[PDB]
Scaffold this active site. Structure first.
Site, PDB file in Angstrom:
ATOM      1  CG  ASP A  99      41.268  42.721  41.195  1.00 30.77           C
ATOM      2  OD1 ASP A  99      40.131  42.369  41.547  1.00 30.77           O
ATOM      3  OD2 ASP A  99      41.652  42.702  39.995  1.00 30.77           O
ATOM      4  CE1 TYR A 207      34.888  42.730  37.954  1.00 27.65           C
ATOM      5  CE2 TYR A 207      34.194  40.662  38.949  1.00 27.65           C
ATOM      6  CZ  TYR A 207      35.206  41.531  38.564  1.00 27.65           C
ATOM      7  OH  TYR A 207      36.483  41.125  38.813  1.00 27.65           O
ATOM      8  CG  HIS A 268      45.841  43.249  37.829  1.00 27.26           C
ATOM      9  ND1 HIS A 268      45.315  44.511  38.031  1.00 27.26           N
ATOM     10  CD2 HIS A 268      45.073  42.376  38.501  1.00 27.26           C
ATOM     11  CE1 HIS A 268      44.218  44.389  38.751  1.00 27.26           C
ATOM     12  NE2 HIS A 268      44.065  43.087  39.085  1.00 27.26           N
TER      13      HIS A 268
HETATM   14  C1  LIG Z   1      35.534  47.726  40.738  1.00 27.60           C
HETATM   15  C2  LIG Z   1      36.390  48.296  39.886  1.00 27.60           C
HETATM   16  C3  LIG Z   1      36.115  49.762  39.504  1.00 27.60           C
HETATM   17  C4  LIG Z   1      37.647  47.618  39.431  1.00 27.60           C
HETATM   18  C5  LIG Z   1      37.644  47.543  37.911  1.00 27.60           C
HETATM   19  C6  LIG Z   1      38.986  46.974  37.403  1.00 27.60           C
HETATM   20  C7  LIG Z   1      39.342  45.599  38.038  1.00 27.60           C
HETATM   21  C8  LIG Z   1      40.694  45.196  37.581  1.00 27.60           C
HETATM   22  O1  LIG Z   1      38.325  44.561  37.676  1.00 27.60           O
HETATM   23  C9  LIG Z   1      39.221  45.602  39.570  1.00 27.60           C
HETATM   24 CL1  LIG Z   1      40.513  46.614  40.338  1.00 27.60          CL
HETATM   25  C10 LIG Z   1      37.895  46.155  40.034  1.00 27.60           C
HETATM   26  C1  LIG Z   2      38.546  36.204  34.346  1.00 28.11           C
HETATM   27  C2  LIG Z   2      38.959  37.319  33.792  1.00 28.11           C
HETATM   28  C3  LIG Z   2      38.276  37.795  32.515  1.00 28.11           C
HETATM   29  C4  LIG Z   2      40.046  38.195  34.361  1.00 28.11           C
HETATM   30  C5  LIG Z   2      40.698  37.609  35.658  1.00 28.11           C
HETATM   31  C6  LIG Z   2      41.757  38.572  36.212  1.00 28.11           C
HETATM   32  C7  LIG Z   2      41.234  40.029  36.455  1.00 28.11           C
HETATM   33  C8  LIG Z   2      42.379  40.969  36.889  1.00 28.11           C
HETATM   34  O1  LIG Z   2      40.261  39.996  37.520  1.00 28.11           O
HETATM   35  C9  LIG Z   2      40.445  40.575  35.275  1.00 28.11           C
HETATM   36 CL1  LIG Z   2      41.604  40.966  33.964  1.00 28.11          CL
HETATM   37  C10 LIG Z   2      39.387  39.568  34.728  1.00 28.11           C
END
Ligand SMILES: C=C(C)[C@@H]1CC[C@](C)(O)[C@@H](Cl)C1
Ligand SMILES: C=C(C)[C@@H]1CC[C@](C)(O)[C@@H](Cl)C1
Ligand SMILES: C=C(C)[C@@H]1CC[C@](C)(O)[C@@H](Cl)C1
Ligand SMILES: C=C(C)[C@@H]1CC[C@](C)(O)[C@@H](Cl)C1
Ligand SMILES: [Cl-]
Ligand SMILES: [Cl-]
Ligand SMILES: [Cl-]
Ligand SMILES: [Cl-]
Ligand SMILES: [Cl-]
Ligand code: NA
Ligand code: NA
Lengths: 297, 287
Positions: A99, A207, A268
């Site tokens: 992840d 994020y 995952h």
């Molecule tokens: C930072 C990213 C490009 C990725 C996006 C997809 C997931 C699953 O949220 C984890 Cl791997 C973080």
């Molecule tokens: C809280 C969430 C919406 C989920 C939690 C698990 C992952 C893999 O981080 C991605 Cl699917 C986001």
């Protein structure tokens, strides 16, 4: 020697990790919304051969949680791991990332190949593949719904946390291949890590700092060096978060030995679903001599 | 002759097109459309009915008040209630697609006296959406752009830059056939999208009514049962709406209800099976 908890200053923050074993440094890096404990099935098995270290990343569980979105930029996250290697008395590590931990591992390997002896990725797309492809992939944009949800200030943390984390637990459980992957006891342990003051904001800041819409839909192209160290990818194909579109031609990013192990019935979290096969594949990959001068002996 | 008209309703000026005489039939578009989405139905229905297709608040040639709270669903519904009255009527047949359909469900639920019959195309019942989405991975995934649209300024920039490249691309990816809109159609769409204020106003619908606090509320929405005959038309291959949101409507309707599925159509069923849609609408009203 048992598992031990330790704390060390790296890149301006105090990072918590657990460690077990002696030998080659093997870092296991979790992602969202996990912490070191996601590796609980691999730590004792791998510690039979290696010096296993599983940190809580910046912002998570017992690690420091600096304020401010820009303190979660990927360059800083990678420097934390570079600093952790040095603080452990080491110069090189085998680096395993799942992840976000996998995103950090791809990045550390590409930009700091000197620090990474071998790379293992579980279910994390290569960052260049995500940045190139997502904007053009409805399937990936759909799967990335939560990335956009998390961009709003304040409100997602409150929603995820209300009613003793009911929504975070529900969204987590709905991401699994089977709803009963985590026990209620596991969920209690996760809530304890989620409840450390500031942890959830810090985790969502990854994020906001790195995957905001201006980045996702950017017309700038990301320069990312090819990976030049042996790489193993473990991939659960039923991944709710990552479209198979993002791993097409993934070997193009690698100019070194590369192997991928597909798990068609896993999602995952392959490390939770097929822990023994994960452990085996990682161990075989690390222990494989890079020099082969005695075929069939 | 199709005629353009403007009328004051609910504090705003609304543009609409109209053709034909008889029973008032309202056709209400959604995002990112305007009256023109009804181009295939208007002439045929105008043979028997007084067809009126308005641009909703914020769109094309209708007024575009500033401020997210000017796009709350109750105001949108009051606009349509006001439109019926301004047209010299007390009730209408009401047909709604997408947001048009959300407004139509709402108008019908709270003002049954104003609605003779209700037609919905590809719009979930609002209470079904509110109850189900928060617990549905499939719907949350399909709702990615709802969350994207919550952010100020950036979605407008992305959707609009390079002469609406992204909006065209995402729109075309939502169709059953990639050639559904001609170049001429696209030029007409871009003209409506480029009206001053139009894109921000359209995204304000999502900010006012579909923000995360609303989606993830545990409060129950109070919504009267529908008390007038209802026809739902549903293209099953809808990129934006899970079939999970339209099944099992019995709780929400206490009047004659029928649903017509179009298995091979997507969100824009009125563009994909224009003749069959028109036929089902006409037959339903004339029964
Ligand atoms: C930072 C990213 C490009 C990725 C996006 C997809 C997931 C699953 O949220 C984890 Cl791997 C973080
Ligand atoms: C809280 C969430 C919406 C989920 C939690 C698990 C992952 C893999 O981080 C991605 Cl699917 C986001
Ligand atoms: C509950 C709503 C307001 C709906 C949700 C789904 C759509 C497709 O975006 C339109 Cl129909 C608006
Ligand atoms: C602009 C977008 C990202 C899309 C296209 C138009 C729709 C149908 O309203 C939904 Cl799919 C949102
Ligand atoms: Cl200890
Ligand atoms: Cl490949
Ligand atoms: Cl498998
Ligand atoms: Cl060799
Ligand atoms: Cl016009
Ligand atoms: Na794709
Ligand atoms: Na569902």
């Amino acid at each position: 020697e048992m598992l031990k908890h330790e704390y060390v200053k790296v890149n301006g923050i105090k990072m918590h990790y657990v460690t077990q074993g002696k030998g080659k440094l093997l870092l296991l890096l979790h992602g969202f919304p996990d912490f070191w404990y996601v590796w609980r099935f691999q730590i004792p098995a791998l510690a039979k051969h290696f010096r296993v270290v599983a940190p809580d990343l910046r912002g998570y569980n017992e690690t420091d949680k600096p304020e401010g979105v820009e303190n979660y930029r990927l360059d800083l996250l990678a420097k934390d791991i570079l600093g952790l290697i040095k603080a452990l008395g080491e110069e090189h590590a085998v680096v395993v990332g799942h992840d976000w931990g996998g995103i950090i591992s791809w990045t550390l390997t590409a930009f700091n190949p000197q620090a990474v002896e071998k790379l293992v990725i579980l279910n994390a797309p290569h960052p260049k593949a995500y940045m190139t492809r997502t904007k053009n992939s409805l399937r990936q944009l759909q799967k990335s719904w939560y990335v956009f949800f998390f961009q709003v200030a304040n409100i997602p943390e409150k929603i995820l946390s209300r009613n003793e984390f009911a929504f975070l637990k529900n969204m987590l459980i709905q991401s699994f291949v089977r709803r009963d992957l985590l026990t209620e006891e596991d969920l209690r342990i996760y809530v304890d890590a989620w409840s450390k003051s500031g942890a959830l904001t810090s985790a969502l800041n990854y994020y906001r700092a790195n995957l905001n819409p201006d980045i996702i839909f950017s017309e700038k192209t990301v320069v990312f060096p090819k990976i030049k160290v042996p790489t193993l990818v473990i991939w659960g194909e039923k991944d709710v978060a990552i479209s198979k579109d993002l791993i097409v031609n993934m070997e193009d990013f690698i100019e070194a030995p590369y192997s991928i192990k597909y798990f068609p019935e896993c999602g995952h979290w392959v490390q939770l679903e097929e822990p023994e096969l994960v452990r085996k594949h990682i161990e075989e990959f690390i222990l494989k001599s890079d020099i082969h001068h005695h075929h069939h002996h």
